[model samples]
Target: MSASAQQLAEELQIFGLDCEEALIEKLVELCVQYGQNEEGMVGELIAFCTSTHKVGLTSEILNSFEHEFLSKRLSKAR
Candidate 1:
């Protein structure tokens, strides 16, 4: 069951993430990169976020995204 952009927005909201249209567009791009198994993808995203914003950095959010990424990949392999 792959997620459509609408489903992605709803799911992100459930995680307490704000899901504006622009954000959804970027997330769709990230999902594409993730599917391609880009190297250090999460780290690059973290870098982008940190560079773009001044605050709200947390280990929990970073770790959660990585965990979610890996879990989804592993599930897809099964």
Candidate 2:
């Protein structure tokens, strides 16, 4: 698979901030609800990949999943 610089540059709209915490939460939540564990796993992968690659998330992206995932966000239980 190959991507064009035009496509890569298109993703520059993303932002890196404290929002990844929420990103992880939604992915785990979806895995809990629908059992598409891949989403959760991908979240972690995306976190590192994006950070290493400098792919960030914008407020719009964060809020995109916040209402649903944020409300249901759970704390890690020991």
Candidate 3:
């Protein structure tokens, strides 16, 4: 269930995260490594984005990603 950085970037943009290429790549790496822990991953993503990119995010957006994107991608792995 590997995903391209570009695909994840598009999804992030849809969620109002206009991340840079490097940031998106880093996030893709994180997703590959810890995507199974959906809750943790959301926190990690939020933390990273806020600290590094100075991007603001809410649980609502991240929850939506978990429900709409991450869950679907994880299901495909099975």
Candidate 4:
């Protein structure tokens, strides 16, 4: 994980980061799967994440997910 991610997670620790660990692990796994496949795995991650929060997918949130979450997760595989 990156330093920023570690720090963000630490900050969220007091609030009890719900599904945070699982989400990161899942997205990192998706990076592997997408490397070998052409499926829309990011969409999957977004769906999973919003559902974990009992919310719906929206561009506002997806934009955050794309940069904040997806970028780092995908970078790990590179």
Q: Assess every candidate by TM-score.
A: 0.39, 0.32, 0.42, 0.30
Instruction: Give lDDT tens digits, candidate 2, residues 1-78.
Output: 222223323232233333344454544454555434333434443454454464555445544543434345555522
Ten residues in a row with the worst lDDT in model 3? 35-44
Candidate numbers, best lDDT first, in rank order: 3, 1, 4, 2
The 10-residue segment with the lowest total lDDT in model 2: 1-10
**Ten-residue region with minimum lDDT total, candidate 4:** 1-10
Q: Tens-digit lDDT track for model 1 on 50-75?
A: 55463443444444555555455654
Ranking by TM-score: 3, 1, 2, 4
Instruction: Highest lDDT: give the candidate number.
Output: 3
On residues 1-78, what C-alpha lDDT tens digit does candidate 3 reach at each position? 664675666556544665556655555555676545333454446544555564655444444544544555565568
lDDT of 4 by residue, 1-78 (tens): 322234334433443334455453443454454452212433344455555684434444434655654566574468
Clashes of each: 0, 2, 0, 0
Instruction: Quote the lDDT for 3 in model 1.
Output: 27
| Residue 31 miss distance in model 4 (angstroms) | 11
Q: Note each model's CA RMSD in angstroms.
A: 9.4, 12.4, 9.2, 10.6
Question: What does the lDDT read for residue 47 in candidate 4?
Answer: 54
Quote the lDDT for 11 in model 4: 33
So what's the TM-score on candidate 3?
0.42
* lDDT of prediction 3: 0.53
In candidate 3 the C-alpha lDDT for residue 32 amounts to 75
